[PDB]
Design a protein that fits this description.
β1 and β2 (about 45-50) form a beta hairpin. The chain is globular. The protein is an alpha+beta fold and about 350 residues long. A 5-stranded antiparallel β-sheet has the order 1-2-3-5-4. Strands 6-9 form a two-stranded antiparallel ribbon. A two-stranded antiparallel ribbon has the order 7-8. It has helices spanning about 1-20, 65-70, 75-85, 115-125, 130-150, 195-200, 205-220, 230-240, 250-260, 280, 290-295, and strands spanning about 30-40, 45-50, 55-65, 95-100, 105-110, 150, 160-165, 170, 180. Bound molecules: 1H-indol-5-ol. 1H-indol-5-ol binds near residues 46, 112 and 172. 1H-indol-5-ol binds near residues 111 and 112. It is classed as transferase. Keywords: fragment, complex, transferase, serine threonine kinase, cAMP, kinase, PKA. It forms a monomeric assembly. The entry is titled "cAMP-dependent Protein Kinase A from Cricetulus griseus in complex with fragment like molecule 1H-Indol-5-ol".
């Protein structure tokens, strides 16, 4: 489909130019006011900030260099920033600035006030198939884009999908994203979403993203993921088993697509066959999807999140507000030279 071919060729050209000459050091911390903590983790946080001169709001991801090193995430954090500064797609959150200081790494991203898909899904219970399909189509196109650039995303889950002011998806958190020719081996992701070949410590490829899409679509339409249990090891046993149970309310088309995405044999899994993404795009479950209209954001969304303005934090939850401390001495300078 020459139109798609030429689109992806241009996309790769533009990505490669930025990939080979990454931007660095494009703002500093005291250009911003701190507003609110939007999320936390073992080695970083995300803050709502306001730029003091323009008044624009942003989501600032702050990574503690010493904790990144301790938790063996050095290459991953370098991956995240190098990839984010080089990509450009309607459903990827934009990196606006990055910089580092003696203690931390900073990625300043567009602020998406609608919150995580996770919150909306848990609030409503489950999405109707048209609603799930609207979001799934955006992920399909996003993975078509990323995979053409030799990128694997490796962290698809509802918490990483923000809903924007038009009700479209913005993918965030490229902490496990990686440029991979051939195979890669790192154990990473979230247990419920891991493909069998990750669990079994194999060399794996982009097929793991298509498996995760199967998990996401199931969870969106059912309200719960297909492989669920108290301990990860019990989850992993279900994932590798080759068995999935579908709610009776699922359409036959949905069940058929999901059996082909949740295919334990990665050599038979949709997205990893000779026809690539088109086995998914042409599946009957997507028969009502106008792929170009989705890309162009011309489809009316299933819902618009409720929020009062670009500074509204109501769709995110409350965390202890901790200091952003910057040591008087540089930490881990060598490890993060390229950031
Ligand atoms: O706009 C954004 C971007 C990344 C994020 N991570 C957590 C909240 C959040 C908001």
């Amino acid at each position: 489909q020459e139109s798609v071919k030429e689109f992806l060729a241009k996309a790769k050209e533009e990505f490669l130019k930025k990939w080979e000459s990454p931007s660095q050091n494009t703002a500093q911390l005291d250009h911003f006011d701190r507003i609110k903590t939007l999320g936390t983790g073992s080695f970083g946080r995300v803050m709502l900030v306001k730029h003091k001169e323009t008044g624009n709001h942003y989501a600032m991801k702050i990574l503690d260099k010493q904790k990144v090193v301790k938790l063996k995430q050095i290459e991953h954090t370098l991956n995240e920033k190098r990839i984010l500064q080089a990509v450009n797609f309607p459903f990827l959150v934009k990196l606006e600035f990055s910089f580092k200081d003696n203690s931390n790494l900073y990625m300043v991203m567009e602020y998406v006030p609608g919150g995580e898909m996770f919150s909306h899904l848990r609030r409503i219970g489950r999405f109707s198939e048209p609603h799930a399909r609207f979001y799934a189509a955006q992920i399909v196109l996003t993975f078509e884009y990323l995979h053409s650039l030799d990128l694997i995303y490796r962290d698809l889950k509802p918490e990483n999908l923000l809903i924007d002011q038009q009700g479209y998806i913005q993918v965030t958190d490229f902490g496990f994203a990686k440029r991979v020719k051939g195979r890669t081996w790192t154990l990473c992701g979230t247990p419920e979403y891991l493909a069998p070949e990750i669990i079994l410590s194999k060399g794996y490829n982009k097929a793991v993203d298509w498996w995760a899409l199967g998990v996401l679509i199931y969870e969106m339409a059912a309200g719960y993921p297909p492989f669920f249990a108290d301990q990860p090891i019990q989850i992993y046993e279900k994932i590798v088993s080759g068995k999935v149970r579908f709610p009776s309310h699922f359409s036959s088309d949905l069940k058929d697509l999901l059996r082909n995405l949740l295919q334990v044999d990665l050599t038979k899994r949709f997205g990893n066959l000779k026809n690539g993404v088109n086995d998914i795009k042409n599946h009957k479950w997507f028969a009502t999807t106008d792929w170009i209209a989705i890309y162009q954001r011309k489809v009316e969304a299933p819902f618009i999140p409720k929020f009062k303005g670009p500074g509204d934090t109501s769709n995110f939850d409350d965390y202890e507000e901790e200091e952003i401390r910057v040591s008087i001495n540089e930490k881990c300078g060598k490890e993060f030279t390229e950031f």
